[PDB]
Design a binder for this molecule. Structure first.
Ligand SMILES: *[C@@H]1O[C@H](CO)[C@@H](O)[C@H](O)[C@H]1NC(C)=O
Ligand SMILES: *[C@@H]1O[C@H](CO)[C@@H](O)[C@H](O)[C@H]1NC(C)=O
Ligand SMILES: CCCCCCCCCCCC(=O)O
Ligand SMILES: CCCCCCCCCCCC(=O)O
Ligand SMILES: O=Cc1ccc([N+](=O)[O-])cc1
Lengths: 269, 269
């Protein structure tokens, strides 16, 4: 149901997205190897992959993550960590929209993700721009799990159109805004967003559509279970804004399904 | 390598061991279907498996676990839970021996394991004996992961030879006493001990030999990685009291390898 090439990208950035939580690097100086505990990111470890800049509780949203250089795959990766306690985050999660005309017209986004991004935007844009300069033929990719996925998606919508494509790989991302934003993210040029979901994961089901939220299209829906390995045959491309029959089903959702994207994510053994 | 049937059994009791942590259980009446969160025990959920008796923080070493009846596989399974925080448990692990001629003359066992068991033995024996009476044809299996693994090993050594075989499946168990106790465990009839380990799991390397501990033989050693699925070829039967070249090898050990026996164990998504 997806190409092998796409399945391979999806797996790689699930692991860069997992590395934002695991593998020690609290102040790991720039240029050190990227490694993780608990076999959370072996495809990353296998590449010639190094930190460019690490951030932590940065700005008003306490945004955390890193920027890496990957000489093997020829990538510049900005990876956002989701929340250190997701069940809590999930309970404290406010549904307020705020206008975001700076990015698009009639577009409202989630207030916390938008503001969190906006507060670190200038420093991070500058860091990506520097790498884009030193490695003009490398692909710029923003990725993240959970909250990290929301942020990556917002950051992507916000920095595209400056002359380098930015591809976004999000895992288990919540909804980030209103229907007009969904649309903007479905069609925006200057890169592709790959919005990946798993089974009846709860987070992509929040904030609810009944608070004004919509999802961009398409969705890449992983139907294999929690703790099950994923093959290219377990992923279905679902087409349409707020399409139903992928993750957006009226059944009961689940938290552990959120922590299994290709492998363990959003928690470290 | 190991047979398909034996593999199945290994997988199954890894799940009955995982269910002691992740059961939606306890304060749950006898006769209830056994189920787990986070796809922790799907092979148990497919079986017609029900609680016989649940225990929580029982006796002197706060023992936790369940006694189960399984009409599909024809089992009576006593599953002991390991610690709620394995890391602190490992850190505060005391290495004192106490004599247990009760179980076998010349035998010394870890003092906290033998006393936690000793303090709940009489109750749990009567619970097992009762179930054996109601289902004389069913096979008695004790199992456990980690400290739970220890308790199942001790309880088995203590309760065998009263008429009914007791098999024991242990996952990531610590050493439970001196040579002689090890030797008893290697030869004792009235049941078999399948003592399963994974890669460089920390827990089976404690207590260290140096403090007067030995491991019973044989050893079933999983060499597939952490978060990697296990096949029959990844399991190596290793013979010899304190044999080296399975888990007992001279390298740095790992906590995450402790938490991956056939799937996630010792923690709940
Ligand atoms: C970092 O990785 C490179 C190649 O991927 C390797 O040659 C180098 O030894 C690594 N550095 C350390 C400290 O392991
Ligand atoms: C318990 O499982 C049995 C068979 O394994 C099933 O028939 C019954 O519906 C279950 N009870 C509940 C409450 O699901
Ligand atoms: C983009 C990085 C976001 C990381 C913020 C995580 C904040 C730690 C969360 C602890 C409490 C909570 O949010 O549930
Ligand atoms: C519930 C978390 C910790 C549970 C451990 C209780 C009994 C552990 C046995 C070890 C006795 C000792 O050596 O300290
Ligand atoms: O599912 C196969 C299977 C094989 C043996 C056992 N057992 O002996 O309990 C259980 C399950």
């Amino acid at each position: 149901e997806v190409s092998q090439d796409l399945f391979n990208q999806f797996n790689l950035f699930a692991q860069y997205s997992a590395a934002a939580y695991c593998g020690k690097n609290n102040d790991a100086p720039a240029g050190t190897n990227i490694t993780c505990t608990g076999n959370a990111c072996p495809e990353v470890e296998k590449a010639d992959a190094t930190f460019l800049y690490s951030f932590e509780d940065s700005g008003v949203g306490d945004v955390t993550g890193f920027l890496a250089l990957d000489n093997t795959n020829k990538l510049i990766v900005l990876s956002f960590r989701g929340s250190r306690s997701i069940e809590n985050w999930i309970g404290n999660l406010n549904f307020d929209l705020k206008e975001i005309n700076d990015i698009c017209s009639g577009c409202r986004g989630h207030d916390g993700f938008t503001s969190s991004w906006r507060s670190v935007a200038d420093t991070l844009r500058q860091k990506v721009e520097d790498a884009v300069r030193e490695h003009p033929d490398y692909r710029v990719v923003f990725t993240g799990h959970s909250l990290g996925g929301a942020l990556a998606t917002v950051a992507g919508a916000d920095l595209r159109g400056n002359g380098y494509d930015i591809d976004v790989f999000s895992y288990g991302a919540p909804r980030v805004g209103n229907r007009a934003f969904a649309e903007f993210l479905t069609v925006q040029t200057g890169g592709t967003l790959y919005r990946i979901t798993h089974t009846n994961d709860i987070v992509p089901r929040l904030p609810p559509r009944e608070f004004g939220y919509s999802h961009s299209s398409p969705e890449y829906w992983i139907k294999s279970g929690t703790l099950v390995p994923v093959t290219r045959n377990d992923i279905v491309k679902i087409e349409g804004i707020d399409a139903t029959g992928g993750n957006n089903q009226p059944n009961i959702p689940d938290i552990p399904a959120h922590l299994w994207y290709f492998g363990l994510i959003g928690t470290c053994l």
